[PDB]
Design an enzyme around this catalytic site. Structure first.
Site, PDB file in Angstrom:
ATOM      1  N   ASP A 142      -3.189   2.950  -5.589  1.00 56.97           N
ATOM      2  CA  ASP A 142      -2.348   2.693  -4.444  1.00 56.97           C
ATOM      3  C   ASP A 142      -2.070   3.957  -3.658  1.00 56.97           C
ATOM      4  O   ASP A 142      -1.865   5.030  -4.243  1.00 56.97           O
ATOM      5  CB  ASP A 142      -1.051   2.029  -4.890  1.00 56.97           C
ATOM      6  CG  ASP A 142      -0.441   1.233  -3.802  1.00 56.97           C
ATOM      7  OD1 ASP A 142      -1.014   0.172  -3.494  1.00 56.97           O
ATOM      8  OD2 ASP A 142       0.579   1.695  -3.266  1.00 56.97           O
ATOM      9  N   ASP A 187       0.503   3.931  -1.379  1.00 53.67           N
ATOM     10  CA  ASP A 187       1.809   3.682  -0.756  1.00 53.67           C
ATOM     11  C   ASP A 187       2.906   4.014  -1.765  1.00 53.67           C
ATOM     12  O   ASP A 187       2.710   4.898  -2.609  1.00 53.67           O
ATOM     13  CB  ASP A 187       1.889   2.246  -0.235  1.00 53.67           C
ATOM     14  CG  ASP A 187       0.820   1.950   0.807  1.00 53.67           C
ATOM     15  OD1 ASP A 187       0.263   2.911   1.381  1.00 53.67           O
ATOM     16  OD2 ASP A 187       0.494   0.748   1.036  1.00 53.67           O
TER      17      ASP A 187
END
Lengths: 255, 244
Positions: free
Chosen positions: A10, A12
């Site tokens: 990821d 984020d």
């Protein structure tokens, strides 16, 4: 003979917040590279291109090519293309989403579109939103890249993609299909690009409610880092938990 | 000794038999007031359109959601610094009421229809609300029927702002009783002798019901013959009304 032979990383949450996390991420990714384990970075961001994100990662000593950056806007274009490559597309969005649609060679239309794709457009207007409503009322499918209602900026919390989708959905009384995290569609579309089997792929991240929940729902094992006693206890009360919880990427063994 | 000595009358598909009905209200000397969720036009503009259709109306007989909203905000805070989204009708109502305007630092955010709204205008609204501004909306209509089809209405934009900020709006227009209570005061009749006349159950009839007013639903607009509470009366045409 590894359990995991593909990694979805990821971009984020708070994954790269501060020098210590950046260094941990650099080390982890460099090791995947040394081990020749395929990986893809995954993001809901729609304000930066794959090239921009890769250029930023490399500047931080985190090995990445633009082909390793996979956004929810790319997922949305790819998901629609595989369902109907001859759909006429009306979209609301910026250059990342337009590029993702260009890549699939779509035709584009306004009020008679077959599919309406709603992404963040920080220059949206009444007319852009009206055309989406009219096309939905003419039967277009309603698809939203992301569901975020507000976006943190230096000015404060600005309207997000989800808030525009809600406008269109309220006006037309038609529900949208959401692609980005925490929905699973972005993760199945990432697996297509990564090429590894679902049961041999792991999603790594450090936010549950938005990010890792997408992996769980998609049927992937998940590693949630940057956890603590209170967060592990909290997740134990939920319907679904990450497969593994750890303090740091440094703690992961390449199982 | 009529049962109804004052009429509140919709314009959102009831007036545009309407001419005959209004004329008879004039011939019978019965006071009336048109109540519209329109937030974009001035009462002069709305009255002129009625007059052009041979329907007797003065600007003083028009009561719009913009007027009601300006009156409501004045009751909350006469000195409020206002950020609004909207067109001529809302701007003029707020200016005539004596308000000054502001952006992110506003005391009150008012959402009316703006067919040239932009991301930035929406963002300023959200930022002011998150700074503590009261969120007020002229009307909740989710769509707007036009030649092109059903365009997004003010309620859709209010929903955007409310979803983004996680703050519920106070709505002024129909079906809320706020516009109705004011209209009833402007008309100057008792609620027991006042009837609300309209075409749309979800706005006109519910506004009357929640305001404690008898209602006449005329099936010339949104709601067909085919809810948990009926209008006091329902008919196919204003021609069928017997001036009770």
């Amino acid at each position: 003979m590894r359990k995991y032979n593909g990694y979805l990383i990821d971009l984020d949450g708070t994954m790269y917040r501060g020098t210590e996390r950046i260094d941990a991420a650099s080390g982890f990714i460099k090791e995947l590279n040394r081990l020749h384990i395929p990986y893809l970075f995954v993001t809901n961001n729609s304000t930066r291109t794959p090239e921009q994100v890769a250029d930023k990662l490399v500047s931080l000593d985190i090995p990445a090519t633009p082909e390793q950056i996979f956004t929810s806007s790319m997922a949305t274009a790819n998901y629609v293309y595989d369902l109907d490559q001859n759909a006429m597309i009306y979209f609301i969005g910026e250059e990342g989403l337009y590029k993702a649609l260009k890549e699939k060679g779509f035709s584009f239309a306004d009020e008679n579109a077959d599919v309406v794709i709603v992404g963040l457009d920080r220059e949206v207007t009444y007319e852009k939103l009206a055309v989406a409503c009219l096309a939905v009322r003419n039967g277009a499918k309603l698809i939203s890249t992301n569901g975020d209602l507000a976006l943190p900026t230096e000015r404060g919390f600005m309207p997000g993609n989800g808030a525009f989708t809600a406008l269109i959905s309220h006006s037309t009384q038609v529900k949208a299909t959401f692609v980005g995290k925490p929905e699973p569609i972005i993760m199945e579309q990432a697996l297509k690009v990564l090429g590894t089997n679902k049961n041999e792929t792991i999603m790594v991240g450090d936010n549950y409610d938005t990010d890792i929940l997408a992996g769980i729902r998609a049927g992937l094992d998940t590693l949630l880092v940057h956890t603590g006693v209170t967060t592990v206890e909290k997740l134990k009360e939920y319907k679904q938990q990450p497969t593994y919880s750890m303090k740091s990427l440094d703690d992961w063994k390449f199982l």
